[PDB]
């Protein structure tokens, strides 16, 4: 069960890698409608403090979650900055979220009567009074409960079905950066010309088994001419010599 609309669940992911191919795998082929960065470069362009949310809304608001457009969920429940970096991910959830008997666990705020600044959560459970009459009570006229429920009956069509959206976002404020995803480990090649790449080292040469003895911490190796000549294999920790061809 994801969090409802009134309280969008926060989750600050950090100190890990980047992997989003499984996101393509979750649902049949669709479009991300990604705003910040082009979808093909989310695996790369790694940042710090990836900022994730989780809440469930209707189908119409999926296209209405865009920054700049207002409404009820986008205005009174969750708003994005105009310089919002990052983008939303949406998929249909008829088979999980929708209930044949009628699931009413998901509720949204329709009455707040105040513009929301970007990126904050408001929990006004108390009832509101309108009409210049002090209500201060329970179940009275002009005393409206600001929290009302979605209806997720499975007989409805596209546009009213539950959609689970995970709005990722990224911020960059100095910092050493902690979130980045590597990939494409390839086979090692011996006694052949190679365009090698070890731990961010770019060069050309022929790799052979070596004899020098490193230290537990030292990785690279440099010669008199101040060039890389010995490199330690990142995966299996032996030492390979580099020779010109």
């Amino acid at each position, epitope marked *: 069960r994801f969090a409802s609309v009134y309280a969008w669940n926060r989750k600050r992911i950090s100190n890990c890698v980047a992997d989003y191919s499984v996101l393509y795998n979750l649902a049949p082929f669709f479009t991300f409608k990604c705003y910040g960065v082009s979808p093909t470069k989310l695996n790369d362009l790694c940042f710090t403090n990836v900022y994730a949310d989780s809440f469930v809304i209707r189908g119409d608001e999926v296209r209405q979650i865009a920054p700049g457009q*207002t*409404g009820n969920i986008a205005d009174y429940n969750y708003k994005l900055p105009d310089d919002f970096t990052g983008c939303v991910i949406a998929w249909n959830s008829n088979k999980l979220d929708s209930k044949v008997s009628g699931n009413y666990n998901y509720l949204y705020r*329709l009455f*707040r*009567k105040s*513009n929301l600044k970007p990126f904050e959560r408001d929990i006004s459970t108390e009832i509101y009074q*309108a009409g210049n009459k002090p209500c201060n009570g329970v179940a009275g006229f002009n005393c409206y409960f600001p929290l009302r429920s979605y*209806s997720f009956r499975p007989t*409805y069509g596209v546009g009213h079905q539950p959609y689970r959206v995970v709005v990722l976002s990224f911020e960059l404020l100095h910092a050493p950066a902690t979130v980045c995803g590597p990939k494409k480990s390839t086979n090692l090649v011996k006694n052949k010309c190679v365009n090698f790449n070890f731990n961010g080292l770019k060069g050309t040469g022929v790799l052979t088994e070596s004899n020098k003895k490193f230290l537990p911490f030292q990785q690279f190796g440099r010669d008199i001419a101040d060039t890389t000549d010995a490199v330690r294999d990142p995966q299996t920790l032996e030492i390979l010599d580099i020779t010109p061809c």
Partner: antibody, heavy 118, light 107 residues
């Protein structure tokens, strides 16, 4: 909780007047106001709506021509037109949106049959 | 925009009998749909809320039901004070659209 009409008179095309509709104690800024259009011999047409957050949604037929605002303390909604093309010989019904999700609140308001002619 | 249509324009033949007034929408819409009742020359009034509720003060015989781009309602008893027009209106899907108009008259 009743609604107070405010409007009248005859105007020429290209001119606009000060449409106002007052409330009897219902908040106009922290609420959901809306005006609609009713013609002699034709059906209703939605004109405009303003939310409590300041979001103005109005029909594309009058794009960039209507300006609407809720008074801070006078409990009266205001609107002004731009560049009348003389098809809005109408009566303008002022109100608030009938129901958010589920409520018994259904009050309406009277409107003045304004006419635009050379 | 949703093309808002209703075929039975004028049910003036019914005098305290079965009434089959109904409305249709182009796109598929849920119960977020209601109607207004308007006497000629004054502001409309509400009878049904969210296509499943009823007005605070009205005869209890009013019962409407509809889903899947089809909304139906019946008024089997034609009291003399209901001689006016009925309008269909879908909302919550901008732009908010209104029906062309339905006529009912007693003989």
């Amino acid at each position: 909780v009743q609604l107070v009409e405010s409007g009248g008179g005859l105007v020429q095309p290209g001119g606009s007047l000060r449409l106002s509709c007052a409330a009897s104690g219902i908040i106009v800024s922290s609420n959901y106001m809306s005006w609609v259009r009713q013609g002699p011999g034709k059906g209703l047409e939605w004109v405009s709506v303003i939310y409590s957050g300041g979001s103005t949604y109005y029909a594309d037929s009058v794009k960039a021509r209507f300006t609407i605002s809720r008074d801070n303390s006078k409990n009266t909604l205001y609107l002004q037109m731009n560049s009348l093309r003389a098809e809005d010989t109408a009566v303008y019904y002022c109100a608030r949106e009938v129901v958010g999700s589920n409520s018994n609140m259904d009050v309406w308001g009277q409107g003045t049959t304004v006419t635009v002619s050379s | 925009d949703i093309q808002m249509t209703q075929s039975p324009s004028s049910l003036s033949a019914s005098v305290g009998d079965r009434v089959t007034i109904t409305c249709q929408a182009s796109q598929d819409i849920n119960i977020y749909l209601n109607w207004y009742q308007q006497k000629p020359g004054k502001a409309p009034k509400l009878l049904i809320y969210d296509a499943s509720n009823l007005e605070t003060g009205v005869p209890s015989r009013f019962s409407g039901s509809g889903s899947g781009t089809d909304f139906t309602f019946t008024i089997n008893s034609l009291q003399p004070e209901d001689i006016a027009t009925y309008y269909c209106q879908q909302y919550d899907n901008l732009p908010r659209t209104f029906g062309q108009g339905t006529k009912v008259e007693i003989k």
